[PDB]
Design a binder for this molecule. Structure first.
Ligand SMILES: [Cl-]
Ligand SMILES: [Mg+2]
Ligand SMILES: [Mg+2]
Ligand SMILES: [Mg+2]
Ligand SMILES: [Mg+2]
Ligand SMILES: [Mg+2]
Ligand SMILES: [Mg+2]
Ligand SMILES: [Mg+2]
Ligand SMILES: [Mg+2]
Ligand SMILES: [Mg+2]
Ligand SMILES: [Mg+2]
Ligand SMILES: [Mg+2]
Ligand SMILES: [Mg+2]
Ligand SMILES: [Mg+2]
Ligand SMILES: [Mg+2]
Ligand SMILES: [Mg+2]
Ligand SMILES: [Mg+2]
Ligand SMILES: [Mg+2]
Lengths: 96, 203, 177, 189
RNA sequence: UUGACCUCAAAUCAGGUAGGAGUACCCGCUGAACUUAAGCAUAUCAAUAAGCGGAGGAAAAGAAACCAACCGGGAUUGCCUUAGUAACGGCGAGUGAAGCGGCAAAAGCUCAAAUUUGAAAUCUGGUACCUUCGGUGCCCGAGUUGUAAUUUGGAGAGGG
RNA sequence: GUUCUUUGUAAAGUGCCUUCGAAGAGUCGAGUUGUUUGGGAAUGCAGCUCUAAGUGGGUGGUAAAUUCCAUCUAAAGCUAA
RNA sequence: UUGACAUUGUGAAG
């Protein structure tokens, strides 16, 4: 991660004596805690499953995991959120 | 505390328990007047994070507003202009339905100040909102340091000028290159960019 | 309208309340641990660790929920009349998870009158005097058999679906002929 | 309206521009007002220097990174290294910027030195209220100017290894261009 | 029978508050056409005039879900500049910002989300008195479906 | 500048060790329609439909899959020149 | 005017 010392190339830039700043607590905003993990687990067993989540579970058992992502992408937004949702449904299926 | 559980449970809007509650409550709201006083918040957890406190001087109102687009109110659809302005049906109001509900409650109680509002329910015809209002004349508010800023005359009819949370979003009051048109006010920015500046010793 | 529709099990569990005989004994024990009134507060303050350790009923939704999560509540009373039902709808599951016995009792106004409030919506006992240990254990066994031990089966049962008086007669008539 | 050999003009005057003409007739008047405001603020506020001490920072961008200028405020780490707290620093006339970070040791050392010199050249009056009269210096920036750091000595010896600088630039440029394609070939094999 | 609670009403009930005017400047909504393109419909005029709602001595914005790609900068506003530039456009007529750099002015902050639980510690009103932009005692009421103290990410909290 | 009250077994700041560290939902985001912008596989705003996550989320000015990196901390609020 | 989605739940058969 050191600079080469010249104005062009991969690690272009001037060499200076590096320092490590203290980590900022705001960088851990999305970090799970013991309190919030307990609440979310308790709510899931109370509320149950959404109608589109039930259809996703059926597709995993009957039509494979690949088609579940295609449907999950349509109900959700981006493709990255569909992958996370499918993995969440797999854990629910596994713990049964 | 129970507020943490309420926050997470409110996010499961399509669960069986919340579907039952939303069907019963939407019927009850439809039977009441379009604007009516609410005895207590329906979502106490949501009210607290928007600034509500359970003390004298805080008032909750419930309001019902019609959904859909804004039909251009011209007779028989005639616009009398160029074809680019002949649209009538597919036009959209530039302010949200939440703002419309907030403004109408403000006129009903002109002695109060609107703090915030939140969504509660909706059907095909209507959306339902609850509005938080503060009494600027009550001594429990005027003697409280955290809330007596609302008593300043500069904060009269905040919802009419779009100074509330929903008003600032519709105005595009945000930072970054995405909001270059409306960072400091769209019309103020336009005036600055369309002004001819001349000095005594011409440049 | 709330009884014509099918009630989900999470809400339907609140239709079962403590019976009159055991509820009367429940309030008899709780009435021995009333919080001190403002008048009793004044005499205590002017006398003042010159005071003995107090024993009183714990109340307050945020206060009681924290007590359950820390394994400190020995018995929790739940009102069935909370109009924003979400405030208390999760308590039976939370108590079941933490192993704290609970009872759905009839009347938020009645819970309030034992804590000098108009309404309370929740009450709990954390520490009881030695002379009342036997009474508390007898109540817990009776209360557990009605709510805690039946939680698994109640969670699977839907409520509601009751027809009106005239609709019931019409259906019964068609079934007979 | 096009004739003769003339440049193409782009004068933007097709709106109601005459309604939005701003002539600065009050340029001299505003200078008098600003000087009056500075004079009345200096007398009103304190024998304080009318401005806060600022740190020295590196200007961003490859076009301006060769110069140092005044930043907004000293970092939390910089004020801690000087032996004071952020809350107390603000009341003594030191600007504190909590969102700036330290990654350069040279900049960090320079800002620490500035804080040391500032504390040695000021007198903090006690809160009792004695407040002996002192001469008011109107500019802390003038008292503590910012200087460009030295880079090299005036003359040295010629140390040539025979390698061409032009060749070095070409090879470094070529290495970056083909880095991705070469890695793919190695991965495939 | 009696007494609570919840919700909903009434009173020339006790005390308050809103309307209208002004509107140069300020915050929003709504919204043209003449005109230009040598015709004309997209475009342009213009996110303008007219219409409607709402403030102040300023308003608004404001302490980053920012800019950057640098050895990084560091709330907002304004001036000089960037620049008639990147870009948009029957790519026609025309339109058109932003980062950096210099300067003016500089100022920072707090709620929600935690059990005071060996003590609702909080507050409106009434009444008596007083050193009256308020204070004290007392009495009802609000409030546990949460009023104070404590902590707002730069952190911070429980123990030693 | 002088003077009357001790506020207070009050309040605040600073070192080291250990366990923790709660952070805003019909919202973000996505599709579509209209309007708007210099913003161009779509700059902002709004209607309808769908509707999240917690080592997460937004942004990095050409759509997409995959692998990294940088940078901030939205959906709550006040504030002179 | 026609279709789709939302409003939109409950039970049975072909
Ligand atoms: Cl808030
Ligand atoms: Mg940060
Ligand atoms: Mg009266
Ligand atoms: Mg404006
Ligand atoms: Mg023409
Ligand atoms: Mg002509
Ligand atoms: Mg013509
Ligand atoms: Mg006008
Ligand atoms: Mg005035
Ligand atoms: Mg001014
Ligand atoms: Mg202001
Ligand atoms: Mg911040
Ligand atoms: Mg800035
Ligand atoms: Mg234009
Ligand atoms: Mg428009
Ligand atoms: Mg890119
Ligand atoms: Mg594109
Ligand atoms: Mg503001």
């Amino acid at each position: 991660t050191v600079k080469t010392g010249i104005a062009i190339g991969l690690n272009k830039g001037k060499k200076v004596t590096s320092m490590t700043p203290a980590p900022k607590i705001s960088y851990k905003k999305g970090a799970a805690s013991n309190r919030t993990k307990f609440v979310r687990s308790l709510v899931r067993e109370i509320a149950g499953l959404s109608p589109y989540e039930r259809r996703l579970i059926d597709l995993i058992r009957n039509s494979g995991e690949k088609r579940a992502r295609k449907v999950a992408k349509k109900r959700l937004g981006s493709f990255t959120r569909a992958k996370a949702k499918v993995e969440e449904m797999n854990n629910i299926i596994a713990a049964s | 505390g129970a507020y943490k559980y309420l926050e997470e449970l409110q996010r499961k809007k399509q669960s069986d328990v919340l579907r039952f509650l939303q069907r019963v409550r939407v019927w009850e709201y439809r039977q009441k007047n379009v604007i009516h006083r609410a005895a207590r918040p329906t979502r106490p957890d949501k009210a607290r994070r928007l600034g509500y406190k359970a003390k004298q001087g805080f008032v909750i109102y419930r309001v019902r507003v019609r959904r859909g687009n804004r039909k251009r109110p011209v007779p028989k659809g005639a616009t009398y202009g160029k074809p680019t302005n002949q649209g009538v049906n597919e036009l959209k109001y530039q302010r949200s339905l939440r703002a419309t509900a907030e403004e109408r409650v403000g006129r009903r109680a002109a002695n109060l100040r609107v703090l915030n509002s939140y969504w509660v329910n909706q059907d095909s015809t209507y959306k339902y909102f609850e509005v938080i209002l503060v009494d600027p004349q009550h001594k429990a508010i005027r003697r409280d340091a955290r809330y007596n800023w609302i008593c300043d005359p500069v904060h009269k009819h905040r919802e009419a000028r779009g100074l509330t949370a929903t008003g600032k979003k519709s105005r595009g009051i945000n930072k970054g290159h995405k909001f270059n048109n409306t960072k400091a006010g769209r019309r103020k920015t336009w005036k600055r960019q369309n002004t001819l500046s001349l000095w005594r010793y011409r440049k | 309208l709330s009884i014509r529709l099918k009630v989900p099990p999470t809400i339907a569990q609140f239709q079962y309340t403590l019976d009159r005989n055991t509820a009367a004994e429940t309030f008899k024990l709780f009435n021995k641990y009333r919080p001190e009134t403002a008048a009793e507060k004044k005499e205590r303050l002017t006398k003042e660790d010159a005071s003995p350790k107090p024993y009183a009923v714990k109340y307050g939704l945020n206060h009681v929920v924290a007590l359950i999560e820390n394994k400190k509540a020995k018995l929790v009373l739940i009102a069935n009349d909370v109009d924003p039902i979400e405030l208390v709808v999760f308590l039976p599951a939370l108590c079941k998870k933490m192993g704290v016995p609970y009872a759905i009792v009839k009347g938020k106004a009645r819970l309030g009158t034992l804590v000098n409030q108009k309404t309370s919506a929740v009450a709990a006992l954390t520490e009881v005097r030695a002379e009342d240990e036997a009474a508390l254990a007898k109540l817990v066994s009776t209360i557990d058999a009605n709510f805690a031990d039946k939680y698994d089966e109640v969670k699977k049962h839907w409520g509601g679906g009751i027809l009106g008086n005239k609709a019931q007669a019409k259906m019964d008539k068609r079934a007979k002929n | 309206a096009i004739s003769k050999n003339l440049p193409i003009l782009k004068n933007h005057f097709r709106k109601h521009w005459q309604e939005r003409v701003k002539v600065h007739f009050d340029q001299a008047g505003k200078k008098v007002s600003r000087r009056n405001a500075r004079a009345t603020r200096a007398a009103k506020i304190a024998p304080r220097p009318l401005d806060l001490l600022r740190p020295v920072v590196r200007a961003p961008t490859v076009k301006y990174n060769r110069k140092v200028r005044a930043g907004r405020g000293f970092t939390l780490a910089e004020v801690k290294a000087a032996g004071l707290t952020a809350a107390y620093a603000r009341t003594i006339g030191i600007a504190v910027d909590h969102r700036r970070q330290n990654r350069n040791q040279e900049i960090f050392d320079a800002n620490v030195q500035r804080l040391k010199e500032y504390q040695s050249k000021i007198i903090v009056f006690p809160r009792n209220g004695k407040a002996p009269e002192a001469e008011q210096v109107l500019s802390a920036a003038a008292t503590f100017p910012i200087a460009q750091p030295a880079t090299d000595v005036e003359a040295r010896a010629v140390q040539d290894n025979g390698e061409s600088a032009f060749r070095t630039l070409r090879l470094a440029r070529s290495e970056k261009k083909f880095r991705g394609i070469r890695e793919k070939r190695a991965r495939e094999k």
